[PDB]
Amino acid sequence: LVVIVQADWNAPGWY
Incomplete structure (x- = not known):
């Protein structure tokens, strides 16, 4: 997210 x-x-990222 x-x-x-x-x-x-x-979203393109976990963090």
């Missing part, structure tokens, strides 16, 4: 670290559910 953030932008750093791989990519979360909706």
